[PDB]
Amino acid sequence: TRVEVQPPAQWVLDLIEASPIASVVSDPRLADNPLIAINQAFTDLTGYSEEECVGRNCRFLAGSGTEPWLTDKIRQGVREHKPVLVEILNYKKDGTPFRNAVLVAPIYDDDDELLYFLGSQVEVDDDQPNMGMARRERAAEMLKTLSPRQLEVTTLVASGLRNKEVAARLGLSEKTVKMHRGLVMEKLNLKTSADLVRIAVEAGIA
Numbered sequence: 001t002r003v004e005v006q007p008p009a010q011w012v013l014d015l016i017e018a019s020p021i022a023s024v025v026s027d028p029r030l031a032d033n034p035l036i037a038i039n040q041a042f043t044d045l046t047g048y049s050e051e052e053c054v055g056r057n058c059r060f061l062a063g064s065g066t067e068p069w070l071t072d073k074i075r076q077g078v079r080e081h082k083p084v085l086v087e088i089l090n091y092k093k094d095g096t097p098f099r100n101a102v103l104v105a106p107i108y109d110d111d112d113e114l115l116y117f118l119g120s121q122v123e124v125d126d127d128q129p130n131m132g133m134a135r136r137e138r139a140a141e142m143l144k145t146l147s148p149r150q151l152e153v154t155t156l157v158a159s160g161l162r163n164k165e166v167a168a169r170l171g172l173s174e175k176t177v178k179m180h181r182g183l184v185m186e187k188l189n190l191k192t193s194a195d196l197v198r199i200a201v202e203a204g205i206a
């Protein structure tokens with residue numbers, strides 16, 4: 001099955017379009033928390049077009065060998081509004097199995113009002129199946145270059161707090177939080193918020 005989805009708003013596109021990583025957004029108020037947008041990298045990773053994905057829950061990538069003890073951790077993150085990174089067996093449109101390092105994280109619309117989920121998928125090769133640990137090592141090194149306030153804002157954003165919540169936690173304005181976020185993105189060459197949440201969760205700071 002599949003539901004018809006409203007074209008994505010600009011903030012949805014801003015979350016994923018410039019990520020070099022397969023990135024998606026879902027809307028949990030729609031039937032079966034379906035995908036409402038995918039980037040180009042997601043089509044290149046999986047072979048599915050945007051028309052084939054949007055309106056469906058992302059578990060269409062699952063197949064015979066997919067680990068329910070790992071997908072349950074995603075289910076838990078979605079229910080608790082917390083980020084989860086697991087490495088699960090998935091299947092491309094042509095039936096090619098691949099190990100998917102998938103991040104599912106809470107994210108907010110550009111008014112900091114309603115909750116959505118972002119998804120970030122990286123292929124782990126059968127060749128180099130410990131690639132996950134190499135991405136963790138890189139992430140940890142990058143985050144150690146951040147100033148203390150930048151690290152604090154990064155941690156709380158990646159933990160799933162909206163900017164208004166980060167602002168309340170640190171005694172700042174939303175504007176000041178958005179400024180610190182932008183400087184982290186510029187310093188670490190991160191294209192989108194999905195890319196920022198991913199290095200935070202890879203490192204284990206969220």
Ligand SMILES: Cc1cc2nc3c(=O)[nH]c(=O)nc-3n(C[C@H](O)[C@H](O)[C@H](O)COP(=O)(O)O)c2cc1C
Nearest residue numbers: 026058059061062071074075102104117118119121
């Ligand atoms: C934004 C987002 C991205 C997701 N990406 C994937 C993915 O790449 N592969 C996949 O198998 N599951 C993915 N999922 C997980 C499924 O949608 C689902 O949450 C998970 O399998 C647990 O739910 P279930 O027990 O009903 O399957 C994603 C979920 C969301 C919300």
Ligand SMILES: [Cl-]
Nearest residue numbers: 032033057078
């Ligand atoms: Cl879901």
Ligand SMILES: [Cl-]
Nearest residue numbers: 171172173176
């Ligand atoms: Cl301030």
Ligand SMILES: [Mg+2]
Nearest residue numbers: 038039040050
């Ligand atoms: Mg596109």
Ligand SMILES: [Mg+2]
Nearest residue numbers: 059062068071
């Ligand atoms: Mg299941």
Ligand SMILES: [Mg+2]
Nearest residue numbers: 109110111113
């Ligand atoms: Mg709005």
